[PDB]
Amino acid sequence: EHQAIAKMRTMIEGFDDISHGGLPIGRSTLVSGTSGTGKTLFSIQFLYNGIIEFDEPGVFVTFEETPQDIIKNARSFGWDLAKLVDEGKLFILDASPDPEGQEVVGGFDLSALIERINYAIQKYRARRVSIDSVTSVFQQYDASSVVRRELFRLVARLKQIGATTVMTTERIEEYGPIARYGVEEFVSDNVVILRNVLEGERRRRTLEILKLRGTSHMKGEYPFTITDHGINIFPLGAMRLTQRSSNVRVSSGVVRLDEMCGGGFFKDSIILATGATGTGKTLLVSRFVENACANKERAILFAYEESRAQLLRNAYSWGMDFEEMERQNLLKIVCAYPESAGLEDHLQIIKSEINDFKPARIAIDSLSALARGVSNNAFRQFVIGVTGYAKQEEITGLFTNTSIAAITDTIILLQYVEIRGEMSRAINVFKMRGSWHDKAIREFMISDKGPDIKDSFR
Amino acid sequence: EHQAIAKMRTMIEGFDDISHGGLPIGRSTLVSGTSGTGKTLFSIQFLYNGIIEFDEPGVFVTFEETPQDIIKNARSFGWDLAKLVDEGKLFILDASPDPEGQEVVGGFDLSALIERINYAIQKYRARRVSIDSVTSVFQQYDASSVVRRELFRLVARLKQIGATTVMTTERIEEYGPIARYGVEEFVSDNVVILRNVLEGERRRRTLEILKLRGTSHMKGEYPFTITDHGINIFPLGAMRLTQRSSNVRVSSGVVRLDEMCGGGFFKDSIILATGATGTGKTLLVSRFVENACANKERAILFAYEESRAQLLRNAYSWGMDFEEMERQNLLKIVCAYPESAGLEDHLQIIKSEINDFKPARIAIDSLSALARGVSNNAFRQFVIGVTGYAKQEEITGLFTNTSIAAITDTIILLQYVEIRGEMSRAINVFKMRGSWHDKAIREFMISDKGPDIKDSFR
Amino acid sequence: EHQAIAKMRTMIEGFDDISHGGLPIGRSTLVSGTSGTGKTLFSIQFLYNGIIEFDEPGVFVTFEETPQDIIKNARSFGWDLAKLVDEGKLFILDASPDPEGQEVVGGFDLSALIERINYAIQKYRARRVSIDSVTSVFQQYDASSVVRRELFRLVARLKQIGATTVMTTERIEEYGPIARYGVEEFVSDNVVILRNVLEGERRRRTLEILKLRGTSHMKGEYPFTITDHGINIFPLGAMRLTQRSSNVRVSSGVVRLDEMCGGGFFKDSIILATGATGTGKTLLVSRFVENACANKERAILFAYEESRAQLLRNAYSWGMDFEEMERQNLLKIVCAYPESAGLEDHLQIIKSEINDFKPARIAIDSLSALARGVSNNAFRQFVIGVTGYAKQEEITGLFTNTSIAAITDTIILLQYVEIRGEMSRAINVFKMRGSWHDKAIREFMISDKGPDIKDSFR
């Protein structure tokens, strides 16, 4: 209702839409998670994007890893930190100890740990601080009520200096307490929790903001993925659309099908073909993709239950010759496998290939193959993400389901009808959005040229 | 995006496809698991394959087992370690204690344990170190925050020496914490966890890489099996195929069936026969196998619900004489039992027999017998593995199911039809991939010669 | 692939098929289980069968029971130990303490416990050692990391002496850790765990080998039963068969059933009669059993729902006179009750009666009565065990099920058909294996003589 707390953009893909503008300026943040969960590179990316984009130097405090290993690990993501250290922008502070030697109590914060930090801040004019593994200095005393004053004096002193801070903490369990001692969540103003939960012999990374005092955020768990470019969080939200085309109807391979359905599929719409097995869905996918090369357009076919070479053989059996249209770079075949990764990584692969090839038509074969063994919520998230990315990029998408409906625009239903001791077939344009769709039920046969929709069942 | 961390191949079957090229060079690795889980021989195999293939000497540090027992245990797998000790390649270091004597604090790392290791490394020019049961030296003090500095100084010193290291740690629970003290996962760069989980009065071994800092890997649990040659992990992934045959259609036993189905089964395809009990599925399996001897080819029949001798009796009742074609080594019968082992063991037996006999036809009788009592995910993994190995080796496979479909290529349906107070039968080629398949529904009878597909039900 | 570890046969019924030849020679073995689970008599039987069969003397170390009580407890199983002590074969060593007195630390191993053991081994030339309740000497100090070196020096010293050793350990929980302190499973080479799990107000004993270093075994839980002769484990595995009979077809009580079904039931086959209640299944069982006395053969009827006297009354109502054929010792009736014991106890009773009477025909009435309230897996094991023992002994078996099928050879289906306001019946030989089986559906009535298969339903 009035003035709010100013925030700082982290430039991590997807985090700034979750926290409503970034992290608050001048306050600490706790990033706690179990082992192997992705919390060391969060601070690395938070420093790197701040240096590169807005030209803000930052410091990095280490407790377990030497700086050379940090630079070597960050070298795999593409970005180089040794050059930025040479330029005097970034300063890796070392507080990890010697492999041999003695100790007394393990030092103290205002002894040297905050003094060297403050000297480096006033020397490099840093704006962002990333203290990593604060649990590595409190470990020497199992004194759960004594670490409160240590964390409190650290957070208060860093607030007095006036720099944005990210702290990192370890867990033991996945859905238990937020940290080890059950103290740090009641001290830090901002809490971010990372999970790596194992269910059904598969892992799944999620991110969650627990509290930001004095401002608003999004509540719940949001999935992410560590890739070659770093952490990639997936948010939600519908931007502006240009859906009002209504006259840029495109063909659907079969001209007899386009006699039905009002004159062709809309350019920005989701088409669903459904039916039992062996009924002719891959034939419709093949027609839909192979029609695109006649207008000199690009198209991608994601196959999830066929072995490419088999697709080429069946296509040449129908008279298609995907190899020729693959030579001219008008068709791409991915030929993946459903259990090779999770639905999250599959969605990332789909988005990367769509961005790489820039097509005009997308055909995902057998969504029902991606729905075997996974949970219902994850599959629903995958379907919504794929459909939203397809409709936002103005791409005609065709999906195949083996026997969602409130999301798709057109539905073609295929089936078997037993006639006189023989198994025939039938086709039916079940629904459309904004067109007349030929309410008859006609039969068809898969000949040696393709589908041939015959007269009705009267 | 840039230069990555160089890796070292362990030559374990299936591990190099999971970790994307092996283990990182010059960094430690934690292999933690419960009792009896296969973590001692992981290090033995990691040393042995490194010596044999690439000629890299290595050292083995012991804490509980005397070297003679290690050599005697490794002798059962076929490989001999005493000769390699004589050649001066491998050096079993002993740090296990005397059965009688005294102690002070149990020694220390830089006292003698790292000094003898470093002396042996500089003496034998070793490249691979396998410290086994590091928990056997930290046990004397229940000081969970004090073992952190010990493990850290060990890992850092071994990194300074610059050798690839594999450490071994014990657990108490299966799905609880990664190790005993909840510390070692936050110290070591690489974590590998082995499980031996008991569910439904059956055991199942799985392997999982939890984190590799600075590189990529596969996430989740992957099953393995300890055999006469060592650990045999089962990866995933489809290599190059030669599916584009389309012309090397083979017969299907019954020439009347080959009048249907377009002219025979394809050479590289999966055939599924389905129906209720008593409808004649083993008859089709018998015809399919006994056709192969007419062209002087090899064929295997995996029986899972019949007692060999009963198969012989029923075959002689149909006129097959399996002894004659078994005497010429053109037919092999396995005669196994479903609850005698798990699905991974069954798949390993199938693969070993296929590799041993080099056949052209595989007939697995009653997949529905293997699916009783097991979980759904394990059965799906078994089906995909068997089908992938069959289609990779260019082998015609016939599977029997008693009343999957998206993986098979042809489907034959059998059923009962009650006509005029009598129970008849019928046949129906339900689907095919890349052929015309005679959409009629005809009856057949199991006479004293075999099946006789009669006219239609009009 | 090469030379393996030599093993020693324990001669316990069923254990030598699980561990592939017995226990390894010269190494310890941990037998841990909760209270009342059957681990004291395991060592007693391991010593006794070694003395009796292979003429190997042994020693028995006691910690809580005086030797006189051990002899008195072993006297109930039939075997006598006092005679073997007199002959100088068995030596029951005593280490249990005095009911009154003092102590210092509770002694020590190399003080007297291993020295008296070694003296007895060198005196009696013993080969087998059975130390019982090793937890009774480490109990005085709750020092879970200090018992490790004690167990280690005990196992190493016993290996140096060179005798096969069986140790016994206690638990508190059923599916928790293997022992009390979570140490002994990481020390001993061989681990055997006994369970006595309570589920559904019933107990069930199982056995499991967890690890044998350097050799192979069976993985999972295997049920056993303590009887008058000792522990009796139930393994799996199909030996040689003589199923190729095909010409010894026996009659089926009703001759009108025998012009159907090809000429009679096969002599070594499993017959299943199924249908609703009140349909006439016990009549078929009665005919099947009472046919056997006409050829002067033996037959057993296991009744599980009816009540002896009632069977006699209904048989005399049908004209059977079971008392006369019982007087000549050609018929035996068991007259048990389903909830009187567990499925393993029922299977053991069935096997004992079959071995005792040496019959030619078994009729188990109402398998569906044994399947009420039990789990699915245990019932499946019961069915497979009964069928395998019946087919291995060359015994014709008839089973009754009230409305499996992939294991039985013939199926007779019985039902109700409502005709014109009256409830009739029908019969149908649903399936056979290796014979022609009269595919019609005929009716029958239960008259005052027996069944009368009438004409068909056309």
Ligand SMILES: Nc1ncnc2c1ncn2[C@@H]1O[C@H](COP(=O)(O)OP(=O)(O)OP(=O)(O)O)[C@@H](O)[C@H]1O
């Ligand atoms: N280039 C990469 N591509 C894919 N995944 C990567 C890549 N680099 C690292 N990873 C993954 O990211 C994770 C590494 O996380 P990071 O080391 O930054 O923190 P952390 O392991 O959670 O920290 P800590 O070890 O202190 O608990 C691992 O799961 C690793 O497999």
Ligand SMILES: Nc1ncnc2c1ncn2[C@@H]1O[C@H](COP(=O)(O)OP(=O)(O)OP(=O)(O)O)[C@@H](O)[C@H]1O
């Ligand atoms: N040359 C051909 N002549 C006749 N029919 C053919 C030919 N090639 C393929 N078919 C037909 O292809 C059908 C197999 O199904 P199809 O490959 O069209 O996939 P789908 O049922 O749409 O879906 P899915 O790929 O998920 O099984 C069979 O019914 C078969 O008749």
Ligand SMILES: Nc1ncnc2c1ncn2[C@@H]1O[C@H](COP(=O)(O)OP(=O)(O)OP(=O)(O)O)[C@@H](O)[C@H]1O
């Ligand atoms: N030749 C073999 N064939 C099959 N299984 C074997 C063979 N040799 C050993 N095994 C099995 O491998 C396992 C032995 O594992 P290994 O001795 O390498 O380590 P571990 O038992 O996990 O170690 P620790 O005892 O320290 O916990 C056991 O399950 C054993 O039954």
Ligand SMILES: Nc1ncnc2c1ncn2[C@@H]1O[C@H](COP(=O)(O)OP(=O)(O)OP(=O)(O)O)[C@@H](O)[C@H]1O
């Ligand atoms: N000599 C024979 N004459 C007539 N019918 C026979 C003969 N031998 C076997 N049969 C037939 O065999 C059938 C038994 O089924 P079959 O052994 O063919 O297996 P299936 O139904 O394909 O599957 P399953 O392996 O589950 O039994 C019976 O219906 C019976 O009619």
Ligand SMILES: Nc1ncnc2c1ncn2[C@@H]1O[C@H](COP(=O)(O)OP(=O)(O)OP(=O)(O)O)[C@@H](O)[C@H]1O
């Ligand atoms: N003759 C017998 N018939 C049937 N069951 C018997 C017979 N004798 C003993 N049992 C049963 O066997 C078990 C006795 O086991 P045993 O005394 O050998 O060891 P344990 O009870 O497991 O040992 P501990 O008391 O040290 O825990 C009891 O369940 C007892 O009821």
Ligand SMILES: Nc1ncnc2c1ncn2[C@@H]1O[C@H](COP(=O)(O)OP(=O)(O)OP(=O)(O)O)[C@@H](O)[C@H]1O
């Ligand atoms: N003397 C009789 N006259 C006519 N019918 C009789 C006579 N005795 C018995 N029955 C018949 O016995 C039937 C009862 O079923 P029956 O005792 O044959 O067992 P079942 O249905 O095969 O199985 P279960 O004994 O397991 O319930 C009744 O339908 C009844 O008609």
Ligand SMILES: [Mg+2]
């Ligand atoms: Mg880290």
Ligand SMILES: [Mg+2]
């Ligand atoms: Mg398809």
Ligand SMILES: [Mg+2]
């Ligand atoms: Mg070990």
Ligand SMILES: [Mg+2]
């Ligand atoms: Mg069969």
Ligand SMILES: [Mg+2]
């Ligand atoms: Mg006892």
Ligand SMILES: [Mg+2]
């Ligand atoms: Mg009855």
